[PDB]
Structure formats: structure tokens, C-alpha cells
Design a protein around this ligand. Sequence first.
Ligand SMILES: CC(=O)N[C@@H]1[C@@H](O)[C@H](O[C@@H]2O[C@H](CO)[C@@H](O[C@@H]3O[C@H](CO)[C@@H](O[C@@H]4O[C@H](CO)[C@@H](O)[C@H](O)[C@H]4NC(C)=O)[C@H](O)[C@H]3NC(C)=O)[C@H](O)[C@H]2NC(C)=O)[C@@H](CO)O[C@H]1O
Length: 364
Amino acid sequence: AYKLVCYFTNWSQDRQEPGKFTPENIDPFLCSHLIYSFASIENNKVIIKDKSEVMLYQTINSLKTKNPKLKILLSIGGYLFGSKGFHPMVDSSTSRLEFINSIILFLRNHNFDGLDVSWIYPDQKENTHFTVLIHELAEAFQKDFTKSTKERLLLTAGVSAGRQMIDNSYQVEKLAKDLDFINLLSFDFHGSWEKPLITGHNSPLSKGWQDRGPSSYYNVEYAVGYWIHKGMPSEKVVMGIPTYGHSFTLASAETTVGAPASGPGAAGPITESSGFLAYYEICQFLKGAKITRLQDQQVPYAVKGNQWVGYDDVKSMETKVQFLKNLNLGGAMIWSIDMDDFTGKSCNQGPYPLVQAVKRSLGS
Ligand SMILES: CC(=O)N[C@@H]1[C@@H](O)[C@H](O[C@@H]2O[C@H](CO)[C@@H](O[C@@H]3O[C@H](CO)[C@@H](O[C@@H]4O[C@H](CO)[C@@H](O)[C@H](O)[C@H]4NC(C)=O)[C@H](O)[C@H]3NC(C)=O)[C@H](O)[C@H]2NC(C)=O)[C@@H](CO)O[C@H]1O
């Protein structure tokens, strides 16, 4: 059966409506797997820094009581944690063992079903440390299993969808044996970090008709194909789908993909971060905007004034699910359900319109 793996985040709790998210906003039957982002590491041991830590625990038990099949994982890593967050824990056998033992105890004590390691990114420098850490975790989880009456703790990893970073960071065949699945981060293909700075879509399914050479790697279709080619079984690929888009401020009258941009788009009023918008912000931006669907890339962008936003909607997600089924992938992953219109109060499409569309397509 296809998985629907849903990340939610610690920091959405600080937002104003309609972006104010706490774990009680989670629908227990919406996803097959939930992933909390992110735990940290202190004195080589896993810890959660979250004033709402006790709420998270209560909610975990409540959700799992309501849906005995639900799996809830703890993620550590992410972009801001970077590689530095894993040091000094990773630099010795004794310090990794301390971490791993703390993980098993913590996960069991708080009713989690497994660990997601989203190291952003190992790159060439930390390839070895990451490979070793994953291997030692898998082994320890297996050893824990043989001595327990409970199910084996799951181990997953959020991984790059960029060909160069994939080649640099990962020993893929080994990863295929140690991981239950990958959460393929198939988004951020384009954004305001690029040079030269031109518009491009966050998460195009396929390449543009004019894309040749390396430009042709920056899409979901290519990333999924590449991971499988490198030795990840298709059923262990859980394909990431974003509920946010990337915005640009246009530098000229041109409004097409590849148009000149002067910088990131204006910050949204709720997420307050120049360069992206959550879906509950996008649906407001679309009012008064001009929407274009790329027939080649299979996704929409919209323009209003000097703002250009590449994003995903119900339609582009239905196409992405047809793709994942056709490639026999393990399911879909969402970054992140707290940026869908979870309350339904913004987009006039009911609660969780994007994730519900995915769930529906997966089961139809
Ligand atoms: C083709 C290619 O290789 N492109 C590179 C880009 O991928 C890269 O941008 C970074 O991409 C990573 C995924 O590879 C992304 O991190 C994951 O994705 C989400 C959404 O972007 C991140 O969410 C952010 O988390 C931080 C805390 O860590 C929050 O502060 C922030 O608000 C979140 N943003 C959003 C929109 O929700 C996650 O951290 C992470 N997910 C997991 C499971 O780990 C980075 O965010 C991307 N970096 C930036 C600056 O956007 C790009 C820059 O490195 O380089 C290209 O080459």
C-alpha cells in the first residue's frame, strides 16, 4: 500500500492564524506516517527543544490511540542544523554509541516508531560520517528488535534531489540496505539562491522543453530516476511534494520561466520569510494574479505586479501522484502539512486541501 509521509514542524506553533499550528491540528487518519521536525543533540544525546514538548507527547499518544496503525517518527537535521549540528556527536565510536543508545530509549519512552535523519547535507566532506552513522543506527535498531517484543524502530532519511549533491553525499546501494525508505526532498529545485538570478519552479515534475544538459536534472522525474538508477529500489523512494512555493521579485517586464529577478519575492504576512510562501498565503496571492500552467513541467506559476511565484496546487499534485504510482514508488511525502491550509480558513477548499487531494489520489 502507498505511504503518505507527512512532516510537521516545531516552529509553526509561533505563527498567527491561519498559520498557527500545534500537534492537535493533526488529523490522525490523514497520513500513514507523521514526522516531527526537528529534534536536536546535546551532550551526544537526542533532545527536543520545544516549550510545547509535553503537548507533543500527549498528542502522539492520543493520535496513536485513535489510529492504532499510525506511525510517528522523530526527525533530526534540516537545513539550519546543517552538518555542524551532528558534531561532535559523529566523530567517534563512543560518542555515536551514546547518541544511538539515547535514541532508542527516547523513541521507546515517548512512543515514536522510528528516526528520520535528514542531514542537509553530508556532501563530500561528511559522506563517510553520514554513511557510518546510518549503518550503526540500522544495526542497533535491528539488535534492539531481536531483544524486544515491540516492532523494529524504523530508520529513514530525507535526502537531496540534486544530482551533484547525491553523487557527493551518499553511498546509495548501502543506504538501500540500511534504510526503511528515503524521504526524497524533491523540491527547492529553483529559488532565489541561484546565480544568475532568474525565475524557476520550486518543484517541476519534468524538465522544460528547452532544458538540455545539466539544466535537465532539476526536476522530480529526473531525481527519482537517478536515485533508482544509483541503486535505491523504487518502493523505498517516498517522493517529496511541497505545500509551499518559491517567490521572486521580477527585474523587468518579462514574466516567463527564466525571466530576470532582482531578488526573492516579498515575505508573506504569516511565514514572514522573503523567498517562500505557504499554500494558505499562496491562495490569497492568487486573487488578482495571472496563473500559467507549464505543459512541459506540469506545474503552475502565477504573476501579480512584480511578484512571480512557482507553486503546487491540487491539479499538479494529482499529476505527481499519477507519476509516483506509475513508477511504483513507496508513496508520497509532504513538506510540510502545517503549510497546507490545515484549518481550511484561507483557501475556501476545506481543511488540508493539498494533502487530502494527495491522499484521495493515492487511494483511488
Ligand atoms: C537541485 C539542488 O540541489 N538544489 C539545491 C537546493 O536543494 C538547496 O536548497 C535547500 O534544499 C533543501 C532540500 O535539499 C531544503 O531543506 C529541506 O527542505 C525544507 C524546505 O526547503 C527545509 O525547510 C526549512 O527548514 C528550516 C529549518 O531547517 C526552516 O527554518 C525553514 O523555514 C524551512 N523552509 C520551508 C520552506 O519550510 C528543511 O530544512 C529540509 N527538509 C528536511 C526533511 O530536511 C533547504 O531549505 C533548501 N535551502 C534553502 C536556503 O532554501 C539550495 C541551497 O542550499 O542549493 C541548491 O543547490
